[PDB]
Enzyme design. Structure first.
Site, short mmCIF file in Angstrom:
data_model
loop_
_atom_site.label_atom_id
_atom_site.label_comp_id
_atom_site.label_asym_id
_atom_site.label_seq_id
_atom_site.Cartn_x
_atom_site.Cartn_y
_atom_site.Cartn_z
N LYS A 44 0.82 -1.21 0.00
CA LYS A 44 0.00 0.00 0.00
C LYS A 44 0.85 1.26 0.00
CE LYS A 44 -0.87 0.99 4.82
NZ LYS A 44 -2.04 1.35 5.67
N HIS A 69 1.90 -3.27 15.42
CA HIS A 69 2.37 -2.12 14.63
C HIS A 69 2.61 -0.93 15.56
CE1 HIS A 69 3.17 0.14 11.04
NE2 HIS A 69 2.23 1.02 11.31
N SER A 72 4.86 4.81 12.39
CA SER A 72 5.99 5.64 11.97
C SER A 72 6.20 6.86 12.85
CB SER A 72 5.79 6.09 10.52
OG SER A 72 6.81 6.99 10.13
N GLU A 114 6.74 -5.85 8.39
CA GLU A 114 5.94 -5.25 7.31
C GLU A 114 6.40 -3.82 7.04
OE1 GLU A 114 1.97 -5.36 8.68
OE2 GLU A 114 1.77 -7.54 8.66
N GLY A 165 7.09 -0.58 4.90
CA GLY A 165 6.73 -0.01 3.61
C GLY A 165 7.55 1.21 3.23
N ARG A 166 7.59 2.20 4.12
CA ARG A 166 8.31 3.44 3.83
C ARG A 166 9.82 3.25 3.87
NH1 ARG A 166 6.12 7.71 5.94
NH2 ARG A 166 4.51 6.69 7.22
N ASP A 170 -0.73 11.67 5.76
CA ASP A 170 0.43 11.05 6.38
C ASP A 170 1.16 11.97 7.35
OD1 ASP A 170 1.99 8.69 6.63
OD2 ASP A 170 3.53 9.53 5.29
N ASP A 209 -8.53 25.08 -5.29
CA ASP A 209 -8.92 25.00 -3.89
C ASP A 209 -7.97 25.84 -3.05
OD1 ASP A 209 -9.64 24.39 -1.29
OD2 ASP A 209 -9.42 22.22 -1.50
#
Lengths: 404, 409
Positions: free
Chosen positions: A64, A192, A195, A269, A271-272, A314, A343
């Site tokens: 993801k 988890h 971050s 796991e 990701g970043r 994030d 916007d």
């Protein structure tokens, strides 16, 4: 198709040099669309660093974070596992040739039809944290191997009372007994930290909690072998708490609570960590306003609806970098940076110090690999920036070494 | 109800005596057992036509230019194009979309004040002459890439009371407007009018009056430097549903006398607007399925549905939306209500649709409805975590199609 197109990186050249070359070449007449430079060699370096820092922990890349087919192909050639949250991610990973035993379906709250898809395609291992999830698994995937996700406290989280995922220890005991009633196999524990971790000791606490739940499984007759320590590891050096400090704390805790002789299998796991620094984004200053001492508003062709959604989703803070290195003597002015959309909330940088820049000048944002393109939209019709994948020869040789 | 080929251009009939809600109920009853219960929209194009009729009756002097960015679905743009309204386009892709459906360039305004040069060149190549601006650098770019454009000066408005404010990002002051007009005269660039946006959600209508007054001043400024100013663009911000404190008719009640006072018809002015939310907000109803459930011990509930802040509910963050869950199945009169939270499908802990609300106990497989989800919802959704965009079912009754025929003629 640019997705599977990879360019060579010549010896003595770095992703930054390639970016500068592209900018210089299109300076006369080209349309100056925002673009990424993605160094797949940086991803190989990250995998090497992981193997060195956490030798007992198998990495399962969190798709993801950045689902680019090139990234998944490279990591698959690296023999790493994949953490998939949905049917689409499972399809993406399997299409590149990854067998199901290298896939974990690590979504604790899955739609029944997607559990069915996972069962049909041989993905056996799934996470869970609730009794209704046990009901759904018993109905749609009765032979699955379940990993119980336990809650971990994040003091700096915005919403501490309402936690989306994770069972408490007390709830964990009941979940294990309920799974025993339903003849559902529970094989491990996942957690988890996130971050936002500031102290590495939280990992230790999480590992300790995992050990507790492991013992609980033994009490109920389950065979617990899988420990999943999740993600949250930093993806660049521009952080207070660096990867090696975290791993330095983690390895002794793993040895103390989960010694290798016990037979435990430890996975993560991240990701970043794999992709954050691999991507550099180049945006063009498409508009400019001067507000009277002298302050500037710059409008660039990527925004919060695009790559910079990480500002809100994030909680990212982005630092603009000048493509053309600035002489120290030149004066700096208070400036704001805005996205292309109509916007008024599409603001990338509220206040920063920059020399006077002009339309057609380029701005660079490093460490834009994680949770940027994966969550971009085409609001107002602005297209996603083109990604240019680069890889040197030696990096490809390293990948070949991994493929064997 | 099952789409025939591709949803984009597929429209279903609405039988006499049936509303959009009834169609939603039929679809839910049909998929009660075997089908995968994916989230879906029901979009009533007849509601959009009714909105156009209401606009014609409330603002007879104002031509509506639909803000494509609000909802870029080809079905909506096709229906509005048949209606013969104009279109407000912010980018090259939107212009391509509108022209592909057959709209001539004189029904397009390129109402982005800060445009990339290459997109200005695209507008010039395809005959889109009218563009907005609010800065000197924009004048330099237009002189280089689109010298024959008709420019509309966007002015700043006091929108502090509005829900969504574009003042900080865009809008020239009157002082700056004078300099911009003189600069445009130096560069031989034609300025034909003024535009303003009071904000997507203004609470006080009076702001429009001040905005209109400001526009009049800039018109006079143009008259001083030799411009022939004829176009007045009053922007958007009109509510798109009845679930608002300030209703459309109150705003138009204030606007029309102001227009008559500052811009009488005999002057020759052409008045247009850029409504996006007004046309589409209530036309879309979203149905999500409860895909997961947790009970927290007095008794509280956490429900997980298959659409979230990365999907249709991004409007919670980008558009400051407040979403009200509605039960598809009518609740029992005396059944108990519990404190509950509603969450999105993704693995992100911030993917929370509703922090706290009162709902009876619901179960996995039950449906939740969200009305007035037309505006700034699908247009800004992403496929984060691999979750796909909900299928959109377009419905239209026979009488609504007759009305569309009336507008076309």
């Amino acid at each position: 198709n640019e997705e599977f197109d990879c360019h060579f990186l010549d010896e003595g050249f770095t992703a930054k040099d390639i970016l500068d070359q592209k900018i210089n070449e299109v300076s006369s007449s080209d349309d100056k669309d925002a673009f990424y430079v993605a160094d797949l060699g940086d991803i190989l370096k990250k995998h090497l660093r992981w193997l060195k820092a956490l030798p007992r922990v198998t990495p399962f890349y969190a798709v993801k974070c950045n689902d680019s087919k090139a990234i998944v192909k490279t990591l698959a050639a690296t023999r790493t596992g994949f953490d998939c949250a949905s049917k689409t991610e499972i399809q993406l990973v399997q299409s590149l040739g990854v067998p199901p035993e290298r896939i974990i379906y690590a979504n604790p709250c899955k739609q029944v039809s997607q559990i069915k898809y996972a069962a049909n395609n041989g993905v056996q291992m799934m996470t869970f944290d609730s009794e209704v999830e046990l009901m759904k698994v018993a109905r749609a995937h009765p032979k699955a191997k379940l990993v119980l996700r336990i809650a971990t406290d994040d003091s700096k989280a915005v919403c501490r009372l309402s936690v989306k995922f994770g069972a408490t220890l007390r709830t964990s005991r009941l979940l294990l007994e309920r799974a025993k009633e339903l003849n559902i196999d529970v094989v491990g524990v996942s957690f988890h930290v996130g971050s936002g971790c500031t102290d590495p000791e939280t990992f230790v606490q999480a590992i300790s909690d995992a050990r507790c739940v492991f013992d609980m499984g033994a009490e109920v007759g389950f065979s617990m072998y899988l420990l999943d320590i999740g993600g949250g590891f930093p993806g660049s050096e521009d952080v207070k708490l660096k990867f090696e400090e975290i791993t330095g704390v983690i390895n002794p805790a793993l040895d103390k609570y989960f010694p290798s002789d016990s037979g435990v299998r430890i996975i993560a796991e991240p990701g970043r960590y794999y992709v954050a620094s691999a991507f550099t984004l180049a945006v063009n200053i498409i508009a400019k306003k001067i507000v009277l001492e002298q302050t500037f508003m710059y409008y660039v062709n990527d925004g919060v609806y695009g790559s910079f959604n990480c500002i809100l989703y994030d909680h990212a803070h982005v630092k603009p970098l000048l493509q053309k290195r600035p002489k120290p003597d030149e004066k700096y002015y208070s400036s704001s940076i805005w996205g292309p959309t109509c916007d008024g909330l599409d603001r990338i940088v509220e206040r920063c110090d920059l020399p006077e820049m002009h339309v057609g000048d380029w701005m660079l944002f490093e460490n834009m690999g994680a949770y940027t393109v994966a969550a971009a939209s085409t609001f107002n019709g602005f297209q996603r920036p083109t990604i240019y994948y680069v890889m040197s020869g030696p990096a490809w040789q390293l990948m070949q070494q991994f493929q064997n």
